[PDB]
Write a protein that binds this ligand. Sequence first.
Ligand code: PLP
Ligand code: PLP
Ligand code: AHC
Lengths: 394, 388
Amino acid sequence: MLGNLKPQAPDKILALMGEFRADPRQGKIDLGVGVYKDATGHTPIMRAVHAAEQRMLETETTKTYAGLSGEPEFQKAMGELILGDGLKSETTATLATVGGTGALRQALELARMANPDLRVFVSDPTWPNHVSIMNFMGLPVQTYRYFDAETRGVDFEGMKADLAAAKKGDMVLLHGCCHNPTGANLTLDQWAEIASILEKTGALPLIDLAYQGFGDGLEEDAAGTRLIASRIPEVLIAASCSKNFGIYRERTGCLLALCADAATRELAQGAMAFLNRQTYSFPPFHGAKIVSTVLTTPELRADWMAELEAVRSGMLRLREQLAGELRDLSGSDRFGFVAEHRGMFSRLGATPEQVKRIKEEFGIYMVGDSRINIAGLNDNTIPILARAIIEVGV
Amino acid sequence: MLGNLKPQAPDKILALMGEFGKIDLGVGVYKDATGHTPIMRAVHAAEQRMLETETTKTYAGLSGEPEFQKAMGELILGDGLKSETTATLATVGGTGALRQALELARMANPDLRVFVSDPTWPNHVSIMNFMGLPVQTYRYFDAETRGVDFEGMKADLAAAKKGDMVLLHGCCHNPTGANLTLDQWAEIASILEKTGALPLIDLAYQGFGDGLEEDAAGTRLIASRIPEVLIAASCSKNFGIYRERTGCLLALCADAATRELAQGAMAFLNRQTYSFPPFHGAKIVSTVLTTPELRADWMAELEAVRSGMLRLREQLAGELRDLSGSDRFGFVAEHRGMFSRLGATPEQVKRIKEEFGIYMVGDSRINIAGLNDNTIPILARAIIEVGV
Ligand SMILES: *Cc1c(COP(=O)(O)O)cnc(C)c1O
Ligand SMILES: *Cc1c(COP(=O)(O)O)cnc(C)c1O
Ligand SMILES: Nc1ccc(CCC(=O)O)cc1
């Protein structure tokens, strides 16, 4: 029977990794990595995180089945981290998920249950994994302009015009901050306008928040999400603790369904809990507990924010250096966008040929869409990247 | 939009838990003499070791770690593990394995039907309904003798066809406790072999029946006869790591070509559902299984648990016998696993729970591990006084 199986395409990421590994060049650089890495090219376990696991290992007396929708301590702590004082629990439904991806998958299954004729709008471009899930689910996908290939900024007029076409009940997916892969983000003013458009159209906003704390700061990064949450009655948020907590493999995420009234919140929470049980029963406990421990424990929380800020500030400094070097070598401020982008990613705006020229001639690897991970750069590699970009004619 | 969400049916087994001289004999978790579900010695040691050796939490394997995959396959199939024709996927618990098992099967056969035992784990049907998969049932439990209605079972299974899937409980049948013998398994294998129906084996209690190896003997028989087999295994109970959410799906194929296909479709299945599988539980399991010292202690403790439970079944059966002279309750000591169905009518069941405080599942499924020397006669009285 299983021979009827249609061959599924590999992750590609691996192929990219293999491409790098075969290269016999000593000065080969890898900017294609999708996770954070410190100065020694390592993805460390955060101090607060290691402390939490140490504490859990000493406090846990059992591992019996726990909450189906996650633990209250975690739901509460997360909604507060994301929504701040604007958290109205009376109308907020929370579901612990298997990472941010799990949260996204669950948000799409929920919406389809509420509206079978659901149509989803995604930015151009967006996290490929978004389209993967949607295509797999067989949902009609529609695109809205977003990245301006010329300025490397946000084509806001195009985005607004495109979103205007959204009908009542349709879903529009927005990255709360640190747009992956572009690194180009909306200003709070641009968010305000988007909201007015969503009110007018009556489309349900699904916010993918996977990098809170990597752009301008924890609070600052949640600003857009918090504006949408106060203007629009129904909002779906997919939060990830993978990167901002550095617990990638633990698979900890969170789905928040903001509702118009309490009756609808019970309807949503029930359907969410139901969705978890029909997929894998209970959600992963470990990473979630680490997170609730860090946020509730004063000492730990403080140390976590402090470490995240050191990471954030460092990446920002790398951005300024690259932009500076690029300025000096270019004799123009053409590449200034690198210093404006937020998140650990940036799309350079180089065509596939230029991307291939950079690799062949300079030994620098990056995603085929010219996306680079700022965290893969340093005082020794920035000069090379600066030269490569210039020499290839970007 | 969300106001259109219809209300859904809840997990009655877990609902009971919430509703809870209180005596809980519901949810399928192991309990010690003091009503606690401890963490196993090896597990605790494994975690301490992990906290000390892990230097990163970056993304890992989409199908799980090689260590976990190999260890699990050896645990389940013993020396019958043919890696060249075996695909393995790490999942979110045994339940996630079942869901993935159905997804994979449905991909390869959009017109598949699933045959389930009467009765069977409620979650089996809910998931199939959710997906919209047609469910057929085969006679399994014998209402009177409390054993297996083997002749009815073979009869119904004979009606399966190429493409159909038959779900079997590898050992310790939930919720009855009635189990097939090896001789019965060999007969089931011949039926399946002639019908071409793909068997899905739910292995959630390996080690709670007769022993680690004996509980996998049936699964190993089917595997050595049927070229294509699917096994959804759970580490929740036998490792006592319920909340960690760890299990795996094994796709046994007839050749390497299909193996690569299955492995690819399985990995894709995780990618489209939640990307990577949880790491913490799978790590504990592999560490225990690959560390001779830890493994030995785990088996020792699992052995202790298994023996104790049998002690209880015997003690309970005895109390009932010496409380009526009615040998009709002997099936209790004959059933193998953590559960056993008293056979009491639904009204009898709800009767005792609201006053005696003994909360058992509606179909009179009792978690034997909930009992103990001082709670046994109280349960025995109830049964006797209410009949059945
Ligand atoms: C990383 C990421 C996620 C979440 O990944 P998980 O590892 O599943 O938490 C979701 N969306 C985007 C855009 C991401 O970059
Ligand atoms: C326990 C059990 C499972 C698996 O539960 P998980 O917590 O998801 O591992 C699956 N099937 C049956 C019959 C079970 O008893
Ligand atoms: N969804 C779920 C429910 C219950 C259990 C525990 C086993 C049982 O009670 O049958 C596991 C999973």
